[PDB]
Design a protein around this ligand. Structure first.
Ligand SMILES: CCCCCCCCCCCCCCCCCC(=O)OC[C@H](COP(=O)([O-])OCC(O)COP(=O)([O-])OC[C@@H](COC(=O)CCCCCCCCCCCCCCCCC)OC(=O)CCCCCCCCCCCCCCCCC)OC(=O)CCCCCCCCCCCCCCCCC
Ligand code: BCL
Ligand code: BCL
Ligand SMILES: CC[C@H]1c2cc3[nH]c4c(c3C)C(=O)[C@H](C(=O)OC)c4c3nc(cc4[nH]c(cc(n2)[C@@H]1C)c(C(C)=O)c4C)[C@@H](C)[C@@H]3CCC(=O)OC/C=C(\C)CCC[C@H](C)CCC[C@H](C)CCCC(C)C
Ligand SMILES: CC[C@H]1c2cc3[nH]c4c(c3C)C(=O)[C@H](C(=O)OC)c4c3nc(cc4[nH]c(cc(n2)[C@@H]1C)c(C(C)=O)c4C)[C@@H](C)[C@@H]3CCC(=O)OC/C=C(\C)CCC[C@H](C)CCC[C@H](C)CCCC(C)C
Ligand SMILES: COC1=C(OC)C(=O)C(C/C=C(\C)CC/C=C(\C)CC/C=C(\C)CC/C=C(\C)CC/C=C(\C)CC/C=C(\C)CC/C=C(\C)CC/C=C(\C)CC/C=C(\C)CCC=C(C)C)=C(C)C1=O
Ligand SMILES: CCCCCCCCCCCCCCCCCC(=O)OC[C@H](COP(=O)([O-])OCC[N+](C)(C)C)OC(=O)CCCCCCCCCCCCCCCCC
Ligand SMILES: CCCCCCCCCCCCCCCCCC(=O)OC[C@H](COP(=O)([O-])OCC[N+](C)(C)C)OC(=O)CCCCCCCCCCCCCCCCC
Ligand SMILES: COC(C)(C)C/C=C/C(C)=C/C=C/C(C)=C/C=C/C(C)=C/C=C/C=C(C)/C=C/C=C(\C)CC/C=C(\C)CCC=C(C)C
Ligand SMILES: COC(C)(C)C/C=C/C(C)=C/C=C/C(C)=C/C=C/C(C)=C/C=C\C=C(C)\C=C\C=C(/C)CC/C=C(\C)CCC=C(C)C
Ligand SMILES: [Fe+2]
Lengths: 260, 39, 305, 54, 281, 54, 54, 54, 43, 54, 42, 54, 37, 43
């Protein structure tokens, strides 16, 4: 079959390459259509459906059967915010920022946003809570690295906000998720592990300043945390990156501010 | 989980199938050997 | 700031023996030690490993293949440990010479041992594929890993088995040995003109670079939104949090389109599968349908003349 | 030879039968290919020579 | 032109340069100062490629090629028809890549997520600069860079490889190839695993991460976790690019002969250099 | 030799029998291939030369 | 041969029938290609020869 | 042959019909290309010879 | 005993049947080797 | 030599027996291949020379 | 007792294992004698 | 030399014994291969030349 | 414990000396057959 | 810790001893096998 051509220069190799181009176009179509399951249909900046909806149509609905009797999810489907957004459009035309109206960190807008998730704890395969405080988790102990318990927590303004009382751990993965920090007032909040730099002397939190440590949301039960509370706490701490920049006591940031 | 009677019946049928397959194989080998012996 | 590359504290507790449905726990072995060195990066626990019928078959076949090549390497060294260490990379288990074609009449020292080792490798790889499919089926999951492995197996078979049959000689296959198979690829290129001008070779390279690009993008995205617990991707698929939304909006504001917490994995599996798929097709065409890829490119508008 | 039925008290018939089918087909293909490899017993080439098809 | 949830994230701030001069969106895209720069550089580069096609005379996209200046121009400039267009297009491409990375930084800041993605892109930018800027400058001419053609930079790859015999005998190259292959394997495994967990057998409930860890401990006896596998993917891809850049920075610069001669050092070690038998000796 | 039955108090028969089957088939294939490699005992070529096939 | 129906108490017909269809088509294609490979039985080239086309 | 309708109690008609359409078109294209490859039955070249188009 | 649960009688019966099969296999192998040695001795 | 039984208070018999079987088969194969390598003791070639099979 | 066997179980297991070992060794010895008679290596 | 037993208060016997077995077999194989490499002490060739096998 | 270590080491050294005795007799036989000094 | 240091020490001692023995064997002198063969007229 070497050198034989049906027409022109077209032969087995050309047939293969052209069939592959057709297949590749079909596959790109299919993959994008699969990627159009969340966040669609498109909205206007006020809330009404848009004039432009995309060259790719929406896909057929599919259903996920969640575990432990949590129910079923249907996507794509009717999706709504299920919360009020505290923003005001800065300009009439489309495609401009919406400024916050009150306190962005409390309103939950911008980088400090959160999604109204399910108000239930996360469950592992067996049916127990996936995240537990270590003192209530039987057999768990720090294995290596600097132990953070008992170390003072320092805010981004170089002032001590409290002391670490406990570690929350993911039971299946056996990796620490949250630190529990007790403030001067005696109440205890949570901080994600990904936001703290456990140093030799202290746990350093560059996201939040000390005065803002009281503003973190709290949990209903001391022995569990739900997805919604997780979302609120994580959004608060992360939005502290942008919305606590003035209080942040950074040398280079101060030099840049003086420059500008 | 199979009981003795079930095992005996299953083995009887399986051996019947095995012997049918072996008979067909034997006639095929005889035909080939007649056509072109390998010894 | 903490970049989440390495864990800064390790905790350990009772070992997780795993889920139990439609799975025979007798075959599952015992939990091995906890390795702190790996605990810095990911999970520290080793095992338990399922050792089924196909597991034993695959282990036996792979052990025999490895040991066969080792014994031939020893014979090639004069059974000298010093020479064996000095020429470990330079040894070879060459396929039968073109004189014998596809025949099994090659002497054991010039082609028979290669056929025996090839049979062992064939059995080992196919038994391992069956093992992957069966392990997915035991837990009730989908068989996606089986099909990606099937793509890899397709390229492997074309390299070692199907293409020699089409060409009509066992000498076309790949010799076992490090520098031996590197030289095999270089000679395969030189014989068939530039393999660069193979269009399916180009597509295979495109999807390999794409695999690297997509895995870098996805790893960076998930590490960047892990501060919102984005690494729990199955939970995000179940109940879309702010991690998925922030990732999607980053990519949408960057390049005009985005994926979901599930579809990006469809992109990943296809960008990885197409590498071996197109590579197998291109290798299969070479020699069988085209004998000079540079001239083919010249005739198809790719090369200047 | 009578008590061989007790093997079915050891092995589930489903797995054994699947493995048997795969093994038998694999062995048959292997032997046919081995015969096709040798210049003799390559029935295709033998019969091409027999009737002077070339 | 907004996603169902995009509204609450479109807020001012998080921009390195320009205040709110370019803090606006065009359709889905986010413009920004560096977005303006990226658009300018990209448009200029593409039009200059088209114009170089006009000068070359061919309108076939696969034959269009923008060669760098010959070796006789050294590291200096060249006429636009015979070398200058390549240099202008290269400056445009470098500017576009850098501006794209910085625009990604701005978007990360506005969304409050970590800066892993522009950092990862910086590795690809550095590999490109090694091939186009660092290695030719080190070696002494712009004629050692590659042409900007679809099938003609493969000619550069082939010629540069075969200048040193079989390029497979390059150790910083072997490591990079093994990293690329491991990365493709890891990507396939990870995508397939998450898909099989999220799309289980027909009629069954969605599986949990516990099932994933159980499956991979059943298969090979070790599971790296979810955070582990994403860390590993990032590290493998970055390491592959890093070692490829190293392999091309030491080639023709501190090593000039065939690359198998390098591997000759291990053979010549004193305590087996002279023993007879084997492949080598 | 009488007490060898006690080996079945050590090993599950399922695993042992699977391993035995795999091992026996592997060994048989290995020996047949070894015989096929040598110019003698390569029964295919021996019979080809005996009946003057080529 | 009468009791062979009991195989359907072992295997779901859906999977068995899908596998059977795939296997039969694959085998038919393989055999047709093998015939097309040999200069004889390459019915395309035989007929071209017979009716004096080229 | 009468009971073949029961195949539709095994397979969803949608998937079967899609697969059938794809397979039939693929097979038809394959056979047409095979005919176009051979110098005979390459109806384009046969006819161009017939009416002296060159 | 407790490793897999079989009792003494079960083990004895299983071993008897297994040894019967082993001796049948060995007998077939022996006749095959005799036939080969007669056809083409290797000593 | 009497107290050697206490080794079974150290090692589980299952793992030890599996390792022993694998090791013994591996060693036997290694020694047979070593003998086959040398021109002498290559019983295949020694016999082929003895009976003039060449 | 890392594996849980008692003294009697260990003694019985060792007795049977040594019986098997001596059977294997006897077969090996007769094989080596046959080979040495056929073709000595000393 | 009397107090050497205290080493077993440091090392688990299982790991130590496994490592010891592997090491001893590896060393024995290494030394045998080294002897086989040299033209002298290559007992195979010393015998073959002594009894005129080549 | 100390007693368990003592007993284990007694058995271990007994086995070690058995192995070394076999090794010594092997070396002696070889040296008679073909010396290396 | 005794464990890691003892394992590393054992591995390193064994490797160093093998290295020195191979160095001795490699040289035409000190190859006790070769000089012994030459001494007693073995080849
Ligand atoms: C007429 C004009 C036509 C023009 C065409 C124009 C358009 C072209 C584009 C077409 C669409 C693009 C592709 C769609 C992608 C997603 C579809 C999908 O996988 O399932 C969707 C969907 C299920 O997907 P899911 O939601 O993720 O899984 C949920 C399940 O509950 C639980 O999951 P699951 O356990 O059921 O598994 C789901 C799926 C998951 O798979 C994946 O997502 C990854 C796939 C990676 C590549 C697959 C293997 C690559 C093979 C390499 C080459 C062959 C090697 C074989 C021999 C090797 C040794 C020699 O795995 C499968 O079983 C799918 C088949 C893959 C195995 C095919 C092996 C033989 C291929 C022979 C080639 C000839 C084509 C035959 C097509 C066979 C169709 C049955 O479909 C179904 O509901 C029914 C299941 C079977 C549907 C088959 C659809 C085709 C899929 C493969 C197509 C490509 C085959 C490779 C050859 C490529 C040739 C160039
Ligand atoms: C990396 C080491 C070598 C090199 C070696 C090779 C080899 C070898 C091959 C390619 C191939 C390609 N290379 Mg190159 N390539 C180099 C540098 C580059 C640069 C650059 C800015 O430095 C670019 C843009 C490209 C671009 C390209 C594409 C034309 C093509 C497919 C790549 C792909 O899909 O990747 C993965 C990326 C994606 C899937 C994302 C989408 C990328 C799109 C398609 C890029 C289009 C660029 C467009 C033409 C520019 C205007 N190469 C350097 C010099 N490249 C392959 C080919 O088929 O060439 C014909 C091929 O075989
Ligand atoms: C001078 C040399 C030639 C050349 C010769 C070839 C040849 C020849 C081939 C490639 C192939 C490939 N080349 Mg090229 N290549 C050249 C230049 C390049 C350049 C470059 C920048 O210049 C690049 C980036 C590439 C890149 C690529 C890859 C895209 C592709 C291999 C995919 C793969 O994963 O294969 C490797 C993956 C596998 C082999 C899959 C293995 C799966 C099996 C199941 C694994 C079993 C494991 C076994 C049992 C052991 C396990 C042991 C333990 C259990 C762990 N080539 C030049 C032009 N290249 C291949 C291809 O597809 O080409 C179309 C190919 O065959
Ligand atoms: C999409 C294609 C990529 C791919 C995919 C892939 N490979 C896979 C899989 C997948 C999806 C598996 O599920 C399977 C696996 O179990 O991975 C952990 C496998 C696998 N890919 C493997 C290797 C491998 N994959 C490679 C490549 C690739 N794999 C492609 C880039 C390469 C290369 C580039 O050379 C290698 C060496 C193994 C890790 C594993 C298959 C293991 C196997 O077959 O084992 C049988 C053989 C033995 C047991 C011999 C053992 C010898 C000694 C005892 C040691
Ligand atoms: C870790 C390194 C891997 C990687 C990472 C990576 N690349 C990335 C990212 C990351 C993490 C991004 O965030 C960024 C992105 O946004 O992707 C969508 C990007 C990106 N990786 C890209 C491609 C790409 N990455 C590649 C490689 C890889 N990228 C590495 C393997 C390759 C190749 C050759 O292997 C390609 C082709 C783009 C899709 C995108 C950056 C897009 C960009 O820069 O846009 C601005 C520029 C233009 C729109 C056009 C400029 C045109 C020029 C002026 C002309 C150039 C001509 C050319 C030289 C011709 C060659 C023929
Ligand atoms: C878990 O998370 C994840 C997701 O999210 C949930 C994701 O989606 C993704 C993102 C990945 C995908 C969406 C999958 C598809 C992506 C690939 C296969 C990678 C290949 C990508 C491309 C080749 C696309 C490249 C497109 C580009 C570069 C668009 C270029 C646009 C311009 C040049 C113009 C930009 C406009 C500007 C600058 C402003 C206009 C200018 C004015 C002056 C006005 C990842 C990784 C992920 O991890
Ligand atoms: C940079 C160049 C991009 C080239 C890709 C072509 C896609 C442009 C179509 C489009 O959506 O334009 C938006 C505009 C705005 O309309 P629209 O596309 O946003 O309408 C709503 C979106 N849909 C319908 C998919 C839901 O489209 C047009 O105004 C023209 C309509 C069709 C005319 C197309 C002419 C361009 C063809 C050149 C292709 C080469
Ligand atoms: C200001 C003061 C006066 C000018 C000083 C310039 C200092 C340059 C440093 C040394 C350079 C040199 O050695 O000159 C001799 C060389 C001539 O080298 P040569 O070819 O004669 O080789 C021998 C070199 N000697 C003799 C010294 C050993 O000229 C160059 O190096 C030219 C390269 C520099 C071009 C810089 C471009 C800047 C664009 C912005 C950067 C963005 C990257 C875009 C990609 C670029 C692609 C074109
Ligand atoms: C180079 O030379 C080579 C290597 C090629 C030669 C190598 C040769 C050796 C290594 C190959 C070995 C071959 C031997 C070992 C294979 C022998 C296989 C035998 C066992 C064939 C068995 C066939 C069994 C037949 C197919 C049985 C089929 C079953 C029937 C369909 C009936 C089943 C119905 C069931 C039992 C229903 C019963 C249900 C209950 C309720 C009663
Ligand atoms: C000291 O340790 C010892 C020596 C004891 C053991 C160590 C051994 C080491 C030295 C082993 C080294 C092994 C080498 C390094 C492994 C290299 C493997 C190479 C790199 C693989 C490269 C290519 C593999 C090709 C693609 C193989 C493809 C397989 C084919 C698809 C299978 C085809 C099967 C057919 C030919 C079977 C035909 C014969 C039967 C009877 C029909
Ligand atoms: Fe993921």
């Amino acid at each position: 079959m070497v050198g034989v051509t049906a027409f022109g220069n077209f032969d087995l190799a050309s047939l293969a390459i052209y069939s592959f181009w057709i297949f590749l176009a079909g596959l790109i179509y299919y993959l994008q259509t699969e990627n159009m399951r969340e966040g669609y249909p498109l909205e206007n900046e006020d809330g009404t459906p848009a004039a432009n909806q995309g060259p790719f149509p929406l896909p057929k609905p599919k259903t996920f059967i969640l575990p432990h009797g949590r129910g079923t999810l249907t996507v794509p489907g009717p999706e709504s915010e299920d919360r009020p957004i505290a923003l005001a459009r800065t300009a009439v035309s489309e495609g401009f920022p919406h400024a916050p109206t009150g306190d962005p960190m409390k309103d939950g807008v911008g980088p400090a946003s959160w999604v109204a998730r399910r108000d239930l704890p996360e469950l592992d395969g067996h049916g127990h809570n996936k995240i537990k405080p270590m003192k209530a988790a039987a057999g768990f102990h720090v294995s290596a690295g600097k132990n953070p318990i008992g170390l003072p927590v320092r805010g981004c303004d170089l002032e001590i906000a409290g002391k670490v009382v406990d570690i929350w751990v993911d039971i299946p993965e056996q990796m620490a998720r949250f630190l529990e920090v007790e403030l001067k007032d005696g109440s205890t909040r949570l901080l994600p592990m990904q936001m703290v730099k456990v140093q030799s002397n202290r746990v350093h939190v560059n996201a939040l300043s000390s005065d803002l440590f009281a503003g973190i949301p709290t949990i209903k039960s001391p022995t569990e945390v739900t997805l919604l509370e997780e979302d609120k706490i994580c959004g608060y701490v992360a939005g502290g990156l942008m919305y606590a920049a003035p209080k942040r006591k950074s040398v280079v940031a101060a030099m840049l501010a003086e420059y500008a | 989980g199979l009981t003795d009677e079930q095992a005996q019946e299953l083995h009887s049928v399986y051996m019947s199938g095995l012997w049918l397959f072996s008979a067909v194989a034997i006639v095929a080998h005889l035909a080939v050997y007649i056509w072109r012996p390998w010894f | 700031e903490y970049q989440n590359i390495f864990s800064q504290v390790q905790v350990r507790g009772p070992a997780d023996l795993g889920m139990t449905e439609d799975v025979n726990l007798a075959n599952r072995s015992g939990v091995g030690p906890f390795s702190t060195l790996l605990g810095w990066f990911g999970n520290a626990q080793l095992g338990p490993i399922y050792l089924g019928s196909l597991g034993v078959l695959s282990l036996f076949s792979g052990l025999m293949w490895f040991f066969t090549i080792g014994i031939w390497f020893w014979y090639q060294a004069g059974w000298n440990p010093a020479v064996f260490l000095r020429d470990l990379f330079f040894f070879s288990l060459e396929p039968p010479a073109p004189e014998y074609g596809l025949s099994f009449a090659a002497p054991l020292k010039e082609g028979g041992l290669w056929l025996i080792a090839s049979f062992f490798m064939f059995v080992a790889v196919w038994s391992w594929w069956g093992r992957t499919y069966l392990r997915a089926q035991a837990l009730g999951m989908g068989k996606h890993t089986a099909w990606a492995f099937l793509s890899a197996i397709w390229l492997w078979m074309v390299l070692g088995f199907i293409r020699p049959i089409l060409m009509g000689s066992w000498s076309e296959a790949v010799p076992y040995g490090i520098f031996s198979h590197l030289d095999w690829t270089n000679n395969f290129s030189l014989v068939h003109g530039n393999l660069f001008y193979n269009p399916f070779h180009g597509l295979s390279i495109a999807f390999l670079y794409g695999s690297a690009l997509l895995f870098a993008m996805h790893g960076a995205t998930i590490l960047a939104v892990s501060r919102f617990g984005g690494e729990r991707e199955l939970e995000q698929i179940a109940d879309r949090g702010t991690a998925a939304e922030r990732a999607a909006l980053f990519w949408r504001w960057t390049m005009g389109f985005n994926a979901t917490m599930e579809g990006i994995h469809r992109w990943a599996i296809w960008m990885a599968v197409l590498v071996t798929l197109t590579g197998g097709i291109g290798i299969l065409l070479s020699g069988t349908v085209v004998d000079n890829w540079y001239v083919w490119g010249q005739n198809h508008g790719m090369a200047p003349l | 030879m009578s008590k061989f039925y007790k093997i079915w008290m050891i092995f589930d018939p489903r797995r054994v039968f699947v493995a048997q089918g795969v093994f038998l087909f694999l062995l048959a293909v292997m032997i046919h290919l081995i015969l096709l490899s040798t210049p003799s017993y390559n029935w295709l080439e033998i019969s091409a020579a027999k009737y002077n098809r070339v | 032109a907004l996603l169902s949830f995009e509204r609450k994230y479109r807020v001012p701030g998080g921009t390195l340069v320009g205040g709110n001069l370019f803090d606006f969106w065009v359709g889905p895209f986010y413009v920004g100062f560096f977005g303006v720069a990226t658009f300018f550089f990209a448009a200029l580069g593409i039009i200059l490629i088209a114009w170089s096609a006009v000068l070359q005379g061919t309108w076939n996209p696969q034959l269009i090629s923008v060669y760098p200046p010959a070796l006789e121009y050294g590291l200096g400039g060249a006429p636009l028809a015979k070398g200058g267009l390549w240099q202008i297009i290269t400056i445009c491409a470098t500017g576009a890549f850098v501006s794209w990375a910085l625009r990604e930084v701005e978007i990360c800041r506005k969304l409050g997520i970590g800066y892993h993605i522009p950092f990862a892109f910086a590795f690809a930018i550095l590999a490109y600069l090694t091939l186009v800027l660092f290695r030719p400058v080190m070696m002494g001419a712009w004629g050692y860079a590659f042409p900007y053609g679809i099938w003609t930079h493969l000619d550069w790859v082939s010629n540069t490889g075969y200048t040193y015999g079989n390029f497979h005998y390059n150790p910083a190259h072997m490591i990079a190839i093994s990293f690329f292959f491991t990365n493709a394997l890891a990507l396939a495994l990870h995508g397939a695993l998450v898909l099989s967990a999220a799309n289980p057998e027909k009629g069954k409930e969605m599986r949990t991460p516990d099932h994933e860890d159980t499956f991979f401990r059943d298969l090979v006896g070790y599971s790296i976790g979810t955070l582990g596998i994403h860390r590993l993917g990032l590290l493998l891809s970055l390491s592959a690019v890093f070692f490829s850049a190293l392999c091309m920075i030491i080639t023709g610069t501190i090593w000039f002969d065939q690359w198998v001669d390098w591997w000759q050092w291990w053979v010549k070690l004193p305590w087996w250099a002279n023993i007879p038998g084997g492949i080598n000796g």
